[PDB]
């Protein structure tokens, strides 16, 4: 039994917003992962590693566990969660919460003629984080995901069935690798494709639409 503490949370709990794509459209910030839990159910996660970073102290060494998690079931929704904690259990749980809060929409296109469902990225996208650059290239139907095991697992959660990958830099740094891959995937809905040149009608936003159904 969760009680919202935000105007957006109250609207989501009531059910005013019919889809999380509306919140994505108006770029409304999300502070509670319960909104993502409500909008996107059956969302599976995957733990990548547990890095035990250390901090030298006067007496000894203060070590805490750093956990990386990628979450998202099958449809243009992936999230990265990085959490540092004293115990692995709470570090993992915080990683899930951050990954749920960091779920992002992913644009999927076609390699050639648009016959069927989208399978690959629409355009060549890239993402750099800490000198690690990940480049995603559209791929024809077949050959699946040609990527590193961690990158392939990350792309298997965004619904991208086919994709070419290129990696540059110190890829052994898992945090930078997954951050760069997540940045590249989130960049998919950042490129002004010519099919988007049409002038969309401006909306309202849920806050303005339901400014009267939200009062107490």
């Amino acid at each position: 039994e969760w009680v919202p503490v935000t105007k957006l949370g109250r609207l989501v709990k009531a059910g005013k917003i019919k889809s999380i794509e509306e919140i994505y459209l108006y770029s409304l910030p999300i502070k509670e992962y319960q909104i993502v839990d409500y909008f996107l159910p059956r969302l599976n996660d995957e733990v990548m590693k547990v890095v035990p970073v250390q901090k030298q102290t006067r007496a000894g060494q203060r070590t805490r566990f750093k956990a990386f998690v990628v979450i998202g079931d099958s449809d243009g929704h992936v999230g990265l969660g990085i959490k540092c904690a004293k115990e692995v259990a709470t570090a993992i749980r915080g990683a899930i919460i951050m990954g749920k809060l960091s779920i992002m929409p992913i644009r999927r296109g076609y390699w050639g003629t648009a016959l069927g469902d989208p399978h690959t990225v629409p355009v060549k996208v890239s993402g750099k984080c800490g000198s690690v650059t990940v480049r995603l290239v559209p791929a024809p139907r077949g050959a699946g995901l040609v990527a590193a095991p961690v990158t392939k697992r990350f792309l298997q959660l965004a619904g991208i069935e086919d994709c070419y990958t290129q990696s540059r830099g110190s890829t052994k740094t898992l945090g930078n690798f997954v951050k760069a891959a997540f940045a590249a995937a989130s960049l998919t809905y950042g490129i002004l494709t010519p099919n988007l040149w049409a002038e969309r009608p401006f909306g309202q936003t849920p806050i303005e639409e339901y400014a009267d159904i939200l009062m107490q």
Binding site: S19, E21, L25, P29, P105, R107, P118, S186, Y189, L192
Partner: peptide, 23 residues
């Protein structure tokens, strides 16, 4: 078929990403 159609800023004709919290 798509998740959503992003809205474009009227001042620069560029789309607004889901994490553009200053838009």
């Amino acid at each position: 078929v798509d998740l959503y159609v992003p809205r474009k800023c009227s001042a620069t004709n560029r789309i607004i990403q889901a994490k553009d919290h200053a838009s």
